[PDB]
């Protein structure tokens, strides 16, 4: 159902973040762009800061998916948004 979708996406936003720290401890700076794969649910996007020293991951859900939690994030220091009520990964 649609908190399974929700979680589904946490996921993939996680194991995204794990990725680019592999990128991170090898070059010492986020990458430019990371290739994401969207759903009929979610659309996912990477954005890195101008020094390429921090990112934001998000999950914007689609209007299929009709979700109180809305558009999730993900940041480099493990920031999760919304910060209470909505993530479980």
Do not use: I
């Given at each position: 159902?649609?908190?399974?979708?929700?979680?589904?996406?946490?996921?993939?936003?996680?194991?995204?973040?794990?990725?680019?720290?592999?990128?991170?401890?090898?070059?010492?700076?986020?990458?430019?762009?990371?290739?994401?794969?969207?759903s009929?649910?979610?659309?996912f996007?990477?954005?890195?800061?101008?020094?390429?020293?921090?990112?934001?991951?998000?999950?914007?859900?689609?209007?299929?998916?009709?979700?109180?939690?809305?558009?999730?994030?993900?940041?480099?220091?493990?920031?999760?948004?919304?910060?209470?009520?909505?993530?479980?990964?």
């Open positions: 159902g649609k908190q399974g979708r929700r979680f589904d996406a946490q996921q993939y936003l996680v194991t995204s973040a794990q990725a680019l720290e592999r990128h991170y401890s090898r070059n010492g700076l986020y990458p430019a762009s990371q290739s994401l794969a969207n009929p649910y979610y659309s996007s990477y954005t890195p800061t101008a020094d390429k020293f921090g990112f934001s991951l998000k999950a914007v859900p689609t209007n299929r998916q009709s979700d109180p939690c809305g558009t999730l994030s993900l940041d480099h220091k493990g920031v999760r948004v919304p910060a209470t009520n909505c993530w479980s990964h």
